[PDB]
Structures are given as C-alpha cells and as structure tokens.
C-alpha cells in the first residue's frame, strides 16, 4: 500500500509470496493450531530442501510446478483478514473518511466551535504554501536523465525543506474515524 511495486517481480520474491499463500491456505485447511504448526514445519521442510539449488532453469520449473500444486488443493474459502481485500470490514469506514478540504466550505458558525483546530489548520496551510516551490524544484532537479523512472519519492535532502508531495500522505484521514 505505502510502497509502489517494482517493474517486475524477482524470483526470490515470487517464492516468498508462494510460501506465504501456501501457509495461509494451509492454516485455513488445518484449522487447529497444532495441526497447522505440524504441516507448516512440513511445508518449510519442502521449501528448504531445494533452497541451495543454484540453477535457474530448474528453479523456475520447480516454482511453476509448486504454483500448479497450490492452485490445486486450494481452499476455495480461505481466511481473509477482515480489514483486508475480500474481508467483511474492507471499506466499511470509507464512508466517514471525509477529506480535509471539506472544511474550507465550513460556515464561520461551525468554525467558531473549533477555533484552536482552525488556527492550527491555517498554520499547516501556510507550511504547505511555503514548501511547495522548493519541493517542486527538488523534484525537477534530481530526475535521472536515463529516461526510466521508479515511482518512488525522494526525501528532503536540504534542511528546512519538507519531503516532496506530503500533503496527501500526511493529512490522510484516519482508518477508523467516528
């Protein structure tokens, strides 16, 4: 979520994510924790066996055979953490995640009830208006001319400068606002 995936997926990453999905589906089959511990030790044994296999031709072939075996004997209704994709409470609170700019249309009456908050808010807005141009130039001056980009953001190299493109990560509405 916070990080952007790379251009392509390496082989070790593929293997780790297969390991994770296999252990999760196995937890789903092996509902009881002891059963799960046992068959998870077995699964780690199955992985670690071909762990020092140096060749790549056979490595990818083993990986694809494992993906096939996983798609087979795959729990149709695997466990899915509630707040995660496919879960009960996935976006259950995405209806109360009102952004911040909805306060620029508030009525002075509604505002007089929360004065300190809006003083702080104007402070923040001044902060942003000041840091904008500096972070923009920090971006334009350190783009690799190779021509290929990476989607990742740089930090605030110079002191007194705020990290570029922060007002949407910061100010991000909370995750359970009520």
């Amino acid at each position: 979520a916070f990080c952007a995936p790379p251009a392509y997926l390496t082989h070790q990453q593929k293997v780790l994510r297969l390991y994770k999905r296999a252990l999760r589906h196995l937890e789903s089959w092996c509902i009881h924790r002891d059963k799960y511990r046992y068959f998870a030790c077995l699964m780690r044994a199955r992985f670690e066996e071909h762990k020092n296999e140096k060749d790549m031709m056979r490595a990818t072939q083993l990986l694809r055979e494992a993906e096939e075996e996983f798609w087979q004997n795959q729990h149709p209704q695997p466990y899915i953490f509630p707040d995660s994709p496919g879960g009960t409470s996935f976006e259950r609170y995405e209806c109360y995640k009102v952004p911040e700019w909805c306060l620029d249309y508030w009525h002075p009456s509604e505002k007089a009830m929360y004065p300190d908050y809006f003083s702080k808010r104007e402070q923040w807005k001044k902060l942003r208006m000041e840091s904008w141009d500096r972070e923009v130039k920090q971006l334009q001056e350190e783009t690799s001319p190779d021509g290929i980009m990476t989607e990742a953001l740089p930090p605030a190299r110079r002191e007194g400068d705020l990290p570029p493109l922060w007002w949407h990560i910061v100010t991000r509405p909370r995750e359970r606002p009520t």
Binding site: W29, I31, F39, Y79, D83, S89, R92, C95
Partner: protein, 607 residues
C-alpha cells in the same frame, strides 16, 4: 368494533411518531434510539389486545380507513385484513423488533448516523406491517416494494464497500423478477374479477387460476429466496447484523410464504401449483442445507439455515397446510433472531471477526451468549417442547403422511439431518474447541442492552410455540396415528445428524491432511450458481445493450438510414443542380430543350 380497530390503527400511529420526529429539531436533543425502542414496546403491548380478543372469539375484521380514488367501476381504499395471520405476525414482529432495537443501540454505538439506522428499521417495520395487514393487493405491493428498497438501503448502509452495493442491487434485481409475477397476478385479477380485494377475489375459487398463481409463486420464489433466486439472501450479510436478524432472517424473506398463505383458498383446487411448490421448497431446503455444511462465515450459515426453513415452509404449502407454515413463520423468528444477535455479540467482541476458524471456545468466555446460542440451535432443530418442535414435528408428520413426491420427502428428511449437522458445526467451531482468536481480550457482554433482548428472545424460543399452539383455534386436522418410525423420525434424524457431525469434527481434529474433494467445493461455493450466472448473464446483457442496441442501431444505422441519407441525397442533388459553368450559350441551349419539350407535350396532348 371500536377497541379492536382503535388499537390496530394506534399501532401504526406509534410506529410513525418516531419518523415524524426524525423530520424535526427534537432529534438533536432527545435520545432517538430509546424513544424508538419505547414506541415499539408500547406498540407491541397494545397489539397484545387484538391478539387476546382473537384468541377469545376468533373473529376477524375488514377495516377500510381512507378512500383513495374511485376509478370507473373500480374503487381503491386503504383496507386492512386483521385475521389470525396479520395479528399474530404483527405481535411477533413487534417483539423481535423491540429486541433488535436495543441490540442496535448497543451494536452500533460507534456509528455517527445511528439515528438514520433506527429510522430505516422503523420504516421497514411499517412497510412489513402494511404488507401483512393488507386486504388490497395494491397495498400489498406497496409493502413489497418498500421492503425491497429498505433492504437496499440497509444492506448498503456502508456505501464505501463496492461489495455491499452489489448485494443490494442483487436483491433489488431478484425481488423485481418476483414483482413481475406479482403484477401478473394483479392484472389477471383486475381483468377477470374487477377487484384487487380478497373478498371479491375469493369468488375465483371455482375458476382456472394457474396464471395468477404462477405469478404469486414467482414472487414468493423471489422474496423467500427459493432456488432460482436464492443467492441475494446470503449476499445480504454485507449489512450490519441487526439488519440480518430483522429483514433477511425473520420477516422480509417470509413475505412470499405469507402471501401464498393469504391465497391458499385458490391453491387447494390446483395441484400443479401445489406440486411445484413442494418441489421448489424441497430443492431449496436440500441445496442450502448442503451449502451451509462447508461455510466458515457464521452469518452465511445462519442465512442458509433461513433459506432451508423457507424451503420447508413452501413444502408445507405444497401439501395444503398453510396454517402450519404460518405457525412455523411465527415460531422461527424467535430463535433465528436470537442466533443472529448472539453472533453479533461475538463479532463485536472479537473485532469484526466473522470466521468461525478464529472464534474458539465461547462457553468459558461468553457463557450467557453461548447458552442462548445453544437454545437457538436446539429450537431450530427439534428438541421437543421448544418453539421449533411445535411446528417442525407436525411438518415432518404431514409430509411423511400424505400423497407426496417421494424425492421431496427424502431430501426434506436429509435436510433436517443437515440442519442438525451445521448447527453442531457452529456449536463445535465456536463453543467447544480451543481458541484461535488473537491474544488480546477485550470481551464484554454485560451491557444490559445486549442481555435483556437476547433473554426475552430466549424465553420466546422456549415457551412461545407451546403458548401459541395451545391458544390458536384448530385450523386443520393432524394425522395422529402413524407407525413409531414416523412419529419419532424427526428426532432420529436430528440425533443422527448431531452424531455424524460430532464424529466428522472429532476426526478433523486429527493430524491427517484435509483435501479439496469435488463434493465439498460444490457446497463451499454455493453450487457455482453465482460464480457462473452472476458473470454470464450480466455479461450478455451489458454487451448486448451496447453493441446491438446502442451503437449498431442508434448511433450507426438509424442515422445512416434516415438523416444521413436525406442529407447526402439533397447535397448531391445540390451539387448537380447548382454547379453550372456560367456560360449563356448552354443556358440558351437548355431553354431550347424546354421549348421543344413544351411543344411536344402540347402536340401529343392537344392539337
């Protein structure tokens, strides 16, 4: 003629007062949930009086309140039919909603728009009472569509989930497919009888009523979530569990069975309709009781159980036993809603977790909720002398003691076994194993909003079937002389189901590896019905609507034919006519052509 009607109307007045307040400035100050709960409680107490007067004299009324519009030869009025059905259902639904209101005041303390939630619950209750106390079919349709839209709004209570709006749209779609048959019935009765009132429709008893009865049956299929149109009900579990305990468990889904009960004087003389009811209900019962044997989401299990019981009610209606089906309707809500509310407590404590795999023992850590859940599961099963028994016993007897299709009988018994089975599945993975839930414990079930409604529903689940079945008049004649292996068959079935599930689970405790057998992937996945239909039929619909309907015709071919052919024709004739060369020689040659043409026309025509 005064007290009865007075109360029948004051109930609606009370249900309305909260909503009229919701459109006022009081709601800012007053506590609206408590107000609504009190109003519902008082409505229930008031409704107890018509119930008494009916238990006493067994008189039923027809009450015309407001004359809406007279269309030539056909009058429309807001008429109420306070029979056994309407009165008893009103009282039961009001008790259950009284409980749900407290449970929501506790289950939704964190929701800012909770007052809107209470208002929507009350609106659904009003629409259901209209759908249940109506003498006219337009009023029935009003309640029908109102229940539909209220389901849409309550399931879609969280309008950020693109998976809840889907379920709401799903329900809308299926219930409109049912509305089609409902409207077919209305039309048939308006043309062949000239009235939508039941008192005048009853004189169609000696006619061929296959068309409107099939309409009503399609409507019941859609609303009671029968086989062809079941999926929407479980998918409706995207909504908060009070919604599931009120609408999609006990009252709304029951509207189809109630409707077919209200028209039983016309089915008794049609065997086609009875047999198709029988088959549809038995098939639903089997299919859902199956699909529930492998579901890990408690809500979905409690919902497939409801679909199975609806199939059983339709079976009952198939062998000409409507009063039994309605008594099961009334006795089912108690323990089903208590079951949903126990689930909701468990879910609110375990931080939204709904997957039994992460529930564990709940006796030690929630003894009260657990006892209530066990009472609910028992009442759902036979467990003699609880609420469920006093109906399901006679259901099984009637089915095994009548000239019925043998396959329906067989799969109904199998489905009662499976009822016991998945009841035990819940009781095992939620009440008898060792924990799988996170290690931090934030459990609290002491709040009186959680305990009082649940224990009221428990008193119900225990004594209400006895009470009713002894206070009701004798409607039908039960067969009470049958072999031992038929009067004790429901209990044998449930017991064998309990034992078999117990063995299977004590086995899955072992260290062998479970596998994806093809006979379980069929149950775990709703029989593939959604997986294929919900993405083949909309695909065709939405690709047709574009390719063949919008572009091909509207944007291409009608344009080419009419306007963009007239335009080309006229612009080409223009290019012809007006693209001259500016030479007087040629103009005068054409003038000569015209001279000659006129002279020739004259010569031939007149000389």
């Amino acid at each position: 003629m005064n007290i009865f009607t007075t109360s029948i109307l004051l109930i609606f007045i009370l249900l309305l007062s909260p909503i009229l307040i919701s459109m006022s400035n009081l709601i800012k100050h007053i506590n609206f949930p408590l107000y609504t709960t009190t109003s519902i409680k008082f409505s229930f107490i008031i409704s107890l009086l018509p119930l008494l007067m009916f238990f006493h004299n067994n008189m039923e009324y027809m009450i015309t309140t407001w004359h809406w519009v007279t269309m030539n030869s056909m009058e429309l009025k807001m008429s109420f039919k306070t029979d056994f059905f309407s009165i008893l259902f009103t009282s039961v639904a009001l008790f259950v909603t009284w409980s749900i209101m407290q449970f929501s005041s506790w289950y939704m303390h964190s929701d800012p728009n909770i007052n809107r939630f209470i208002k929507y619950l009350t609106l659904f209750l009003i629409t259901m009472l209209i759908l249940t106390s109506a003498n006219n079919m337009f009023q029935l349709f009003i309640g029908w569509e109102g229940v539909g839209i209220m389901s849409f709004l309550l399931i879609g209570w969280w309008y950020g989930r693109t998976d809840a709006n889907t379920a709401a749209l799903q329900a809308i779609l299926y219930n409109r497919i049912g509305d089609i048959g409902f409207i077919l019935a209305m039309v048939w009765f308006s043309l062949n009888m000239n009235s939508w009132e039941l008192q005048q429709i009853m004189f169609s008893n000696n006619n061929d009523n296959l068309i409107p009865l099939m309409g009503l049956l399609i409507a019941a299929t859609g609303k009671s979530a029968q086989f062809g149109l079941h999926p929407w009900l479980p998918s409706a579990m995207e909504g908060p569990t009070p919604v599931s305990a009120l609408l999609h468990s006990s009252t709304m889904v029951v509207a189809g069975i109630f409707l077919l009960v209200r028209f039983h004087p016309l089915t008794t003389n049609n065997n086609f309709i009875l047999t198709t009811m029988l088959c549809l209900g038995a098939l639903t019962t089997l299919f859902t009781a199956i699909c529930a044997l492998t579901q890990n989401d408690i809500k979905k299990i409690i919902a497939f159980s409801t679909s199975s019981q609806l199939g059983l009610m339709m079976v009952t209606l198939g062998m000409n036993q409507p009063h039994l089906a309605f008594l099961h309707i009334c006795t089912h809500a108690f323990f089903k809603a208590m079951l949903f509310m126990c689930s909701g407590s468990i879910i609110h404590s375990l931080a939204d977790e709904q997957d039994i795999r992460k529930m564990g023992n709940i006796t030690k850590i929630m003894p009260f909720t657990s006892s209530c859940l066990v009472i609910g599961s028992l009442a759902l099963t036979g467990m003699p002398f609880l609420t469920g028994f006093y109906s399901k016993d006679l259901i099984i007897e009637a089915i095994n003691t009548c000239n019925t299709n043998a396959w329906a009988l067989l799969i109904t018994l199998i489905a009662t076994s499976m009822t016991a089975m998945y009841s035990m599945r819940i009781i095992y993975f939620v009440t008898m194993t060792k924990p799988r839930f996170p290690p931090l414990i934030s459990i609290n079930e002491n709040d009186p909003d959680l305990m009082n409604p649940i224990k009221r529903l428990a008193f119900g689940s225990i004594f209400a079937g006895f009470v009713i079945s002894y206070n009701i008049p004798p409607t039908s004649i039960p067969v009470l002389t049958m072999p031992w292996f038929l009067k004790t068959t429901a209990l044998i079935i449930s017991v064998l189901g309990f034992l078999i599930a117990l063995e299977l689970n004590n086995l899955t405790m072992k260290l062998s590896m479970n596998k994806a057998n093809p006979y379980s992937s069929f149950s775990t996945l709703l029989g593939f019905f959604p997986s294929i239909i919900h993405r083949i039929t909309p695909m065709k619909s939405l690709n047709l609507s574009l390719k063949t309907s919008l572009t091909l015709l509207d944007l291409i071919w009608l344009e080419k034919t009419i306007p963009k052919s007239t335009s080309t024709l006229h612009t080409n004739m223009t290019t012809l006519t007006t693209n001259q060369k500016g030479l007087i020689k040629l103009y005068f040659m054409s003038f000569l052509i015209n001279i000659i043409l006129i002279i020739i026309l004259y010569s031939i025509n007149l000389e």
